[PDB]
Amino acid sequence: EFITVARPYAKAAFDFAVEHQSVERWQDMLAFAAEVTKNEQMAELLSGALAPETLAESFIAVAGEQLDENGQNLIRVMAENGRLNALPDVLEQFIHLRAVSEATAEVDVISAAALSEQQLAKISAAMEKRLSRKVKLNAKIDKSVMAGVIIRAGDMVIDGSVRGRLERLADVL
Amino acid sequence: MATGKIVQVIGAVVDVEFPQDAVPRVYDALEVQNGNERLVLEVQQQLGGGIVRTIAMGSSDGLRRGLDVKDLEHPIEVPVGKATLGRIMNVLGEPVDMKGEIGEEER
Amino acid sequence: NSTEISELIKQRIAQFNVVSEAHNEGTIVSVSDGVIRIHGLADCMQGEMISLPGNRYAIALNLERDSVGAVVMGPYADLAEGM
Q1: Under a CB-based contact definition with an 8 Å cutoff, are residues B25 and C77 in contact?
Q2: CA–CA separation, C80 vs B96, rounded Å?
Q3: Nearest by CB to C29, which of B25, B45, B49?
Q4: Contact between residue A86 and residue A6 where contact means Cβ atoms under 8 Å apart
Q5: What is the radius of gyration, based on Cα positions, of chain A?
Q6: How far apart are CA B23 and CA B49, in angstroms?
Q7: Residues A12, A74: Cα–Cα separation, whole Å
């Protein structure tokens, strides 16, 4: 897993994209690179011991979607360090650094049944106060919980479900 | 011509990278100019792509990264036969008795 | 775009003919002390006999996630990365 070795590359790519006000182009470029990493044949080549400046060039060849200077340079650095497989995580941490920079968040709302669209309005209004960030919502439905709602925002959760109330009563006794 | 480059030097151990066609075989002998003086390396391992790990047959001090390395396409080979009687030689078959060139006919 | 991206990737790979090995075939990528690492051999099975150039055999002992480690049953110094 590359959660840790991806942090420096995502941070460098984001700090560069900001200087040039191209964050969106960089995100799409990384999203394409992290896809070419997943192809059946390319994932074979990435594992075999090729010399870095050969693997990097064969990888560059498969992408005209990369602005020839700054995206290809990132590919060449990651290739020199032997980390092209880390791109699918560079993408996630780039999206994270962006969401932080623009003060945005994305809340999952899980319920036994879909909400009335006034509840959703008040939920978003409330969370945009719990968090400084402008919040999207993704409503989701799960009939294990049977009343109330779960609000999950990052690693924080608010366990408003009655299922939670029951399991939390059982353990008082 | 010289077709390899040093990429590490750690004590007596030197790593050299070649284009992936010309990788020397194990026990092949390489050569590099350690200053005004020649130095030969014996390949011990083929590891990874293009790179080859070697043991220096001499003083390792003074080696830079990026020196050109030329690969002799044969192991360390020494003079043999009647020409060597009464001479002193080092592991590379060079005379160390100051009586000059060996006069070998065969290696 | 999420589908035509994959399609374009497949197309462009076919253009530059980066290709996979045959399942019963592979390339040496490392040699040392009589042990070789082979890349490929998707169908190699633990304990199999692998046939090298020069009519010699190696025994596949380590089937790792990306390469096969095999010991050479004979003189090994003439093997080279690429065979």
Answers
A1: yes
A2: 35
A3: B49
A4: yes
A5: 21
A6: 9
A7: 9
User: Which amino acid is present at A72?
Assistant: Q
Quick check: B70 and B96 in contact, CB under 8 A? no
Suggest the residue from A35, A46, A62, A87 to mutate for an interface test with chain C (most C CBs closer than 10 A): A62
How far apart CA A165 and CA A25 sit, in angstroms, is 46
d(CA A33, CA B91): 53
Strand partners, A84: none
Tokens representing C34 are: 């009589």
Judged by CB atoms closer than 8 Å, whether chains meet at C31 and B45 is answered as yes
CA distance B103 to B101: 6
Domain that holds residue B36: 1-75
Preferred mutation among A47, A50, A81 to probe B, highest tally of B CBs within 10 A: A50
| CB proximity B17 to A under 8 Å | yes
Find, among A136, A58, A74, A76, the residue nearest to A103 by Cα: A136
- Residue B29's φ and ψ, nearest 5 degrees, are -105, 130
Query: CB of A112 within 8 Å of any CB in chain B?
Result: no
- The whole-angstrom separation of Cα C83 and Cα C74 is 16
B49 interface with A at CB cutoff 8 Å: yes
The ranges assigned to domains in chain C are: 1-83
Residues A146/A112, Cβ–Cβ less than 8 Å: yes
CATH code at position A63: 1.10.520.20
CATH for B69? 2.40.10.170
**Number of Cβ within a 10 Å radius of residue B101:** 9
End-to-end C-alpha distance for chain A, whole angstroms: 41
Task: Name the CATH code of domain C1-83 (choices 2.60.40.60, 3.30.200.20, 3.30.70.120, 2.40.30.20).
Answer: 2.40.30.20
Instruction: Name the residue of chain B whose CA is nearest to A51's CA.
Output: B49
- Reported residue count of chain C is 83
Q: Who's near B104: CB < 8 A, 6+ residues apart?
A: B79, B80, B81, B83, B84, B93
Do residue C77 and residue B49 have CB atoms under 8 angstroms apart?
A: no
